[PDB]
Amino acid sequence: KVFERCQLARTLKRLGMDGYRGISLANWMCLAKWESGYNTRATNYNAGDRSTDYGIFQINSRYWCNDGKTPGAVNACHLSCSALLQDNIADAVACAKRVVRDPQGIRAWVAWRNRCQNRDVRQYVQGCGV
């Protein structure tokens, strides 16, 4: 599924993402926008280390989900990476929350650092009723 902007903002708010571990909804929107263009079935294979990024948040298989084909990988979210390719984003949200419970927080995603950190992200939630 490719979410429209505001529908995703409300979906995320309903899932308890607004202010989760101090991360505003606008930051999560900026993250999903730059990681996948709000696309839940997005995938990116990293030929360099044999891992793959999954879903709307492009969560990596080396540490977060199990896809059975990533060397020496772990599964911190305790999910099959398949769960991160569903139209329903509940599991991807549970996993994204798990990611940010770690020291880096929202900084775990380099794209957030490149396109969201110290930027005016208000535009991502404007007019969505959130």
Interacting residues with Na ion (CB under 5 A): 61, 66, 73, 75
What residues form DSSP beta bridges with 4? none
Measured from each CB, the residue nearest to Na ion is 73
Q: How far is the CB of 33 from Na ion (least distance, A)?
A: 25
Nearer CB in complex with Na ion: 42/95: 95
Alpha carbon of 58 to those of 31, 61, 68, 82, 113: distances in Å?
Answer: 9, 9, 17, 12, 14
Contact between 116 and 125 under an 8 Å Cβ cutoff? The reply is no
The residue ranges of DSSP E strands in the chain, in sequence order, are 43-46, 51-54, 59-60
The active-site residue, picked from 53, 87, 91, 120, is 53
Nearer CB in complex with Na ion: 40/66: 66
The active-site residue, picked from 35, 67, 91, 120, is 35
Known catalytic membership, residue 35: yes
What's the one-letter identity of residue 75? Answer: N
Nearer CB in complex with Na ion: 36/61: 61
Q: How far is the CB of 31 from Na ion (least distance, A)?
A: 20
DSSP structure class, residue 59? E
Just list the catalytic residues: 35, 53
